[PDB]
Amino acid sequence: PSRLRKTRKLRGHVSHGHGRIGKHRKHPGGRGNAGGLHHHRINFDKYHPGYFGKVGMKHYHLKRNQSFCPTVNLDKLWTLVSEQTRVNAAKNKTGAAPIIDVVRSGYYKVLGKGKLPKQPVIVKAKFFSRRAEEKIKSVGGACVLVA
């Protein structure tokens, strides 16, 4: 809607909101990121530290698929199964524990953030964190690995 814009309120004002002294000129100061080290150095230093230079090893032909390892925390772990599984395991008289396969859910690593409800469970994952393993063992569960 051009009828709601500031141009419609600037009719009759000769400078169009850009000043009489400095005016509105084409490109004072350069085009784009001009002078990032010379006359716009303060802005780049103040708001973009680390912008200039090389750090680290360069690796040609990076394949993002090779390092694909999505993660799931322990507090969200029980959401990967239906609540029917949870209540069946919780109210179960025997010591039977359900098996949660996070790879089926699309997660490869089990991270250890959060806490678990105190009931045993078997977790099928490609990778486990140390604290995630400790928390699963503490509730009587077990961790198994898949490839």
Binding site: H27, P28, G29, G30, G32, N33, A34, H40, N43, F44, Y47, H48, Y51, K63, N65, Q66, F68, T85, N88, A89, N92, T94, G95, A96, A97, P98, I99, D101, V103, R104, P120, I122, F127, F128, S129, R130, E133, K137, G140, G141, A142, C143, V144, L145
Partner: protein, 210 residues
């Protein structure tokens, strides 16, 4: 000229982009034309399936997707020769073939050959001369059971074999998954250098006493 806080932006508009702009105003017309072509093809091949030849069971390559299975280009020649189908007859009866695909493992081979055998079981085949039924199929089951098949033939589905809840054994409880993974990484890293050091020690061992 930068102004206060703000993201450093790199527009790729320095290369006279206005002469090469693709507008999509023909997108609805293109969809209509594609739908008309689809309907025309489906009417052209009257009893044959609309989508076309049956496609094989195919696991996706990389480590990101190898849990997922999809449809492939065509059945491998090994699948055809163990399913009893000639590789030149298969394309005549709606079986896509792929001469350049190998079968690295037997499980996928068995899955694809069971797919082929079940498809051959479901196939209705018309004789070349309708008045002279030679060896194709019986007229009773091809009169009113012959239907245009919509969608992909025998669609590929991800099946998840459910495993039931079980009482956790002690040897699962004593398993050390983090330690096992760390030591597996260490062994994979240090395998070659360990072999070289063992070989060096063996070379020093066979000349120590002299």
């Amino acid at each position: 000229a930068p102004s206060r806080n703000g993201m450093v932006l790199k527009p790729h508009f320095h290369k006279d982009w206005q002469r090469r702009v693709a507008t999509w105003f023909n997108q609805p017309a293109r969809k209509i034309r594609r739908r008309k072509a689809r309907q025309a093809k489906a009417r052209r091949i009257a009893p044959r399936p609309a989508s076309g030849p049956i496609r094989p069971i195919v696991r996706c390559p990389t480590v990101r997707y190898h849990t997922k299975v999809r449809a492939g280009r065509g059945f491998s020649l090994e699948e055809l020769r163990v399913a009893g189908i000639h590789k030149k007859v298969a394309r005549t009866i709606g079986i896509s073939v792929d001469p350049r695909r190998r079968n690295k493992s037997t499980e996928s081979l068995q899955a694809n050959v069971q797919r082929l055998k079940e498809y051959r079981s479901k196939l209705i085949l018309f004789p070349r001369k309708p008045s002279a039924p030679k060896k194709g199929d019986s007229s009773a089951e091809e009169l009113k059971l012959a239907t245009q098949l919509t969608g992909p033939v025998m669609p590929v589905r991800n099946v998840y074999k459910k495993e039931k809840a079980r009482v956790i054994t002690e040897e699962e409880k004593n398993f050390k998954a983090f330690a096992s993974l760390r030591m597996a990484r260490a062994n994979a890293r240090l395998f070659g250098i360990r072999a070289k050091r063992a070989k060096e020690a063996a070379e020093q061992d066979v000349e120590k006493k002299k």
